[PDB]
Structure 1
């Protein structure tokens, strides 16, 4: 590469996994109480009864049908594993960002092989073959072409970063509302109640 460096992320994947583990343990063992203040423990059945009350069904229905609900939840979460493992292209949204960034970087690299009207695309070759007074004419064309390509790359990256920020804000709002609480907004947290 030619001046192309990649900066490692500040939060390593182990830390992000630890954060998700903290989120998930807190929501299992406390419900939504850990979001508001200190984590208050609750039996998981009673939390489910509270959430049934939240969606409009009396907590009677949970206790009369606890085993069936547990079996249905286990079957659904197993089907999640089966769908993820067997079926492909489920993560196309995540793959699109990687593909777009790689393609932009590749075209930025490949724009270094264009003459841009000069006698060659190799600057050292121009220097070695030509005297200084005439070399500047070709070098200026090379400078113009490479500056324009770099400016185009930077503009596209800014426009893409704006969309990534919008998606990150949506993900943060969904983490705050779907995970740390129970939402009454229709279709915000999955489909159904």
Structure 2
């Protein structure tokens, strides 16, 4: 109820639709397991890290069979078939090539680590703002009006389950910005003036719930000759 109040809906809505809301939540949770169970490219983000690391290590190891313009890629036979004054002329080329390989590997690793750190910072911010509280930033904790979030752990990563509120089954109405009565203008305290064709009510913005217009849910604050589009009706005391 607190969270519905946080997104702009009164508490009686939840207290009167509790069973339906619970059933909808249960079904939505039930569908997640099936959705993740039968989708091939579901966790590609976590698999890419492993693939890249394995590929880099394999390239580094394979680079050891190159010659770099020498007689052989093995040091043992170079040492066993040549004299010291002539072996270094072959050894230094291997040294240069292998140093270059190590340097390339280390630079690539640094560049990847920076991106991983940025991703981890984003995940920490999301953990603070969507799990430990209710967020008002749009599209930060799911699509819709945020209610809550749940974390789960995965190899080298995290998975967030966002629960959101989505409106449905809209209807069209005639509206007006103010009501004229006794030469006085009336604006709603919170809500909007609505008309079903013959009668006028005041309703909350995100859920249809018409009420009788009264001095308890409006304020006067002005005259009747300034507002454009004003509609005159009766306001009960």
TM-score, normalised with respect to structure 2:
0.60
Corresponding residue for residue 16 of structure 1: none
Q: 1:54-76: CA deviations, max 9, x gaps?
A: 11111111111111111111111
Which of residues 28, 48, 57 is equivalent to 1:96? 48
TM-score, normalised with respect to structure 1:
0.74
Aligned-residue offset at 1:137:
0.8
- 1:83-122 superposed matches below 5 A: 83-122=35-74
1:141 aligns with 2:125: no
Consecutive unaligned residues of structure 2, counting only runs of 5 or more, are 146-237
Aligned-residue offset at 1:92:
0.2
Corresponding residue for residue 152 of structure 2: none
Matched residues, number: 145
1:78 aligns with 2:78: no
Which of residues 140, 150, 155 is equivalent to 2:107? 155
Q: Distance in 1 between matches of 2:76 and 2:13?
A: 80
- 1:55-66 superposed matches below 5 A: 55-66=7-18
Q: Distance in 1 between matches of 2:69 and 2:22?
A: 71
Corresponding residue for residue 128 of structure 2: 176
Aligned-residue offset at 1:128:
1.1
Q: Distance in 1 between matches of 2:133 and 2:12?
A: 22
Alignment partner of 1:89: what SS?
Answer: helix
Aligned-residue offset at 1:132:
1.2
1:128 aligns with 2:83: no
Aligned-residue offset at 1:127:
1.0
Q: 1:93-149: CA deviations, max 9, x gaps?
A: 000011011101100001111001111111112111211111101110000000000
Q: Distance in 1 between matches of 2:63 and 2:116?
A: 26
Structure with the larger strand share: 2
Corresponding residue for residue 203 of structure 2: none
Q: Distance in 1 between matches of 2:63 and 2:93?
A: 13
CA RMSD of aligned residues (A): 0.7
Consecutive unaligned residues of structure 1, counting only runs of 5 or more, are 1-48
- 1:16-35 superposed matches below 5 A: none
Aligned-residue offset at 1:152:
0.2
